[PDB]
Design a binder for these strands. Structure first.
Lengths: 91, 108, 77, 94, 93, 106, 97, 78
DNA sequence: TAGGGAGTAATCCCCTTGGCGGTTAAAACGCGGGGGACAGCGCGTACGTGCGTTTAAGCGGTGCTAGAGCTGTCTACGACCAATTGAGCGGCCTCGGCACCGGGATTCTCCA
DNA sequence: TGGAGAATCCCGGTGCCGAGGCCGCTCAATTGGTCGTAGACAGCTCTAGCACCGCTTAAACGCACGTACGCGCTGTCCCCCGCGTTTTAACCGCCAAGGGGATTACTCCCTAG
């Protein structure tokens, strides 16, 4: 029974080290993660099918993020994603 | 075999690039999924998580508490223009409302 | 006749949370009507998923799916 | 307190708490009363009824906000059936 | 170039329901859009149903359930009826 | 042996084959069952017929033999069930239902 | 000499424009506005003739639907005149605001 | 400017189609503002699809996808 | 380790960019001018406040089994594959529904 | 009850452009086998939902009273409305030009297995 709990916890103890989070709040945050995942993945799939592609590349994920997230949110998200993919490629 | 370096790390991430990849691939978003795609999506998911949790801990401190709960998540998601636009049609259990009383109803 | 179990006080509290200062007495029966229509829409979908799954028990997920289907995503389950 | 002030105190009380505002057993009985029109002898997870309640209370609270603005627009401080129907009207729920 | 559309089948059905009536290219575009849209809806909901219940096949039963979720009121009952007729004719033949 | 279309075998005008292809190649599922395109074609045909019937009536009422966009708008908005199905949909050259609010009349 | 009373010709129009399918905003002003905006997102774009018409149809459909909701708000407040107030309550209850 | 090409008469006609009997002079500039916000949202998405497709021309499909993204599905194109 | 999707170069055409000139419908204006918005005021009734009694909400126990979830089998249905052919796509055909225009017959306003 | 004259509707002839249609043809849809596993089914466990029972006491509910708010009524005259009017520039019809969306062909490294 898989959940993004673990990771929510690692991020929390990175951003507010002495603060915990409740079980209910963990549930809500996990739901948040699943929802955003779904939305981005789905928009990406649509973009792919619309351009007659059959693959969801980094560039699909980027454009999905730019369609979905607003303003500064979108910009910062694009930035983080690009940084991550760059580091991955380097390694 | 050479030692197994987790992709999350290879990436400098806490989030599970591995699981994200399974979900994209086994999740029928398309016939083929690149490595880049998992990495980027995992990163974006981490960023938004970070923002929400940060604002929530800020709220929790403002109310002198050590533990992030649903009401805190809710007040965080509503005080930011961008998160409130992202989650504008989402209901958070045990979150409550933001305090708001109209002017005309206030004492005169 | 269980609808009137949604009490006048219960409706009053919800109107208070919604920032309402004074409540005309006809609101209580409108609110019951509105709530019943909303519940019927969600429960019909929840039961539809339940039947499809060949279950006899409505689960929390069936309700969460029904709410998401209607643009009222419910976080926490 | 001078009249109308206790109302603003009650509003504050209800806006700072996270508790559920409908009684659990009345709501549960309403859910089952509606359900048996769609299929008889349905069982419910305990958590499923609570999910319905949270969604239902969140819906009604949001509706009352829109209702309030309809009243205030008409230069009233009292909400009325008309205000609910306009809110439902413009939301496209009609 | 090549651009396939439902215009043929729309026209066949029109000449069964109202033989004297025709259909403009703009109206045909709308009908082509409509068929595409509701195909995407029912196929999409059937996909979700399959994924949810951990099934890998959009069977008749998924499509039936999708139809009950998507169409309002009597449209659901009639759509489910015609679908049930169609699969009965098919499987019995 | 001679080819018999699944459309005709199912008693449908709508193309069971084309619908089957689109379900496979639209990435909706790993597998598409044999009954699925038959059912979906039946439903799309039914709903096509329902709108075209009401649009044909609308055309007849306006003394024309051709369905123009206006007739599809009148067909959709005057049926509660179509208007609930297509409530958020805009139809080009459709116009609006004739509707003046009660308090505006002299 | 002859004068239809204020309100009469208005109802004549409400009948005329509710019976017609035509686009009410002239096309060229609209095309210019559509472009004028687009060049803030990407320079030297081209537009299909049909793309501008799709934008116009959607824009007119949006504004007319907004004005229906606006009208009901005015009527609720016992007015016949729509104002910023009405438009804004309409946009809010809908969800846009 | 170009937004003032959405003339007072044009806005009047649209209000008339919506059943509006009397129009305050402040409506015209509010309507222009509201229209500009709507067009910006749709064009932003349309350009986003256009860029993704590696095209320089915005197509009818890009506009239809942008509208469907925003819950305002348009039939008659595509 | 396999193999085919996609990135790329040679190629071009169709539909978009663009201009030009004439017409006229439409947009915007020089000046009057009004009816329904709004403010004020009075009154009555219905909602708020509080006080007392009734009523089941809510806690908590007990018990029971329905039914959700797992587990192992096996089959029949779908993916695939190769050959075959006819239904559907392009585009050319041709004639009739609609647009249009004018002209005449009528319903309607609003105010005498 | 009664006109001037405006907005409106109905008829009829014209003609044009697109509604309803026909010829090739090709590539997708069918036929006909093969196979292997996804899912249907049957059996079994035990979780949790249902059902019930007694008690406590928080809240609901019923009542009484009064007041302030909703609502009706009156009177004033704003800034938006309105005309014929004057101005303006879209629209229309036609034409040149060529951008970049679309096609084909190939080649290779991307991701699946």
């Amino acid at each position: 029974k898989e959940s993004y709990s673990v990771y929510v916890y690692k991020v929390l103890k990175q951003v507010h080290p002495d603060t915990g989070i409740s079980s209910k709040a963990m549930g809500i945050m996990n739901s948040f993660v699943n929802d955003i995942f779904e939305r981005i993945a789905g928009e990406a799939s649509r973009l792919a099918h619309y351009n007659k592609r059959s693959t969801i590349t980094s560039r699909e994920i980027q454009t999905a993020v730019r369609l979905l997230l607003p303003g500064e949110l979108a910009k910062h998200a694009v930035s983080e994603g690009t940084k991550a993919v760059t580091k991955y490629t380097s390694s | 075999r050479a030692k197994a370096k987790t992709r999350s790390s290879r990436a400098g991430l806490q989030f599970p690039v591995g699981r994200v990849h399974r979900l994209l691939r086994k999740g029928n978003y398309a016939e083929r999924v690149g490595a880049g795609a998992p990495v980027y999506l995992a990163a974006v998911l981490e960023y938004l998580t970070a923002e929400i949790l940060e604002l929530a801990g800020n709220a929790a401190r403002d109310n002198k508490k050590t533990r992030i709960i649903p009401r805190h998540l809710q007040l965080a998601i509503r005080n930011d223009e961008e998160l409130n636009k992202l989650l504008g049609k989402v209901t958070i259990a045990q979150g409550g409302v933001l305090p708001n009383i109209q002017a005309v109803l206030l004492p005169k | 006749d269980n609808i009137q179990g949604i009490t006048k006080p219960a409706i009053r509290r919800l109107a208070r949370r919604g920032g309402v200062k004074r409540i005309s007495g006809l609101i209580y029966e409108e609110t019951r009507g509105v709530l019943k229509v909303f519940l019927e829409n969600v429960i019909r979908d929840a039961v539809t998923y339940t039947e499809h799954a060949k279950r006899k028990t409505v689960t929390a997920m069936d309700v969460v799916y029904a709410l998401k289907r209607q643009g009222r995503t419910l976080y926490g389950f | 307190y001078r009249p109308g002030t206790v109302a603003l105190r009650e509003i504050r009380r209800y806006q700072k708490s996270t508790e559920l505002l409908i009684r659990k057993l009345p709501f549960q009985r309403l859910v089952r009363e509606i359900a048996q029109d769609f299929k008889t002898d349905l069982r419910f997870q305990s958590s499923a009824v609570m999910a319905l309640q949270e969604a239902s209370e969140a819906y009604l609270v949001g509706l009352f906000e829109d209702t309030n603005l309809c009243a205030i627009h008409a230069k009233r401080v009292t909400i009325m059936p008309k205000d609910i129907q306009l809110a439902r009207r413009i939301r496209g729920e009609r």
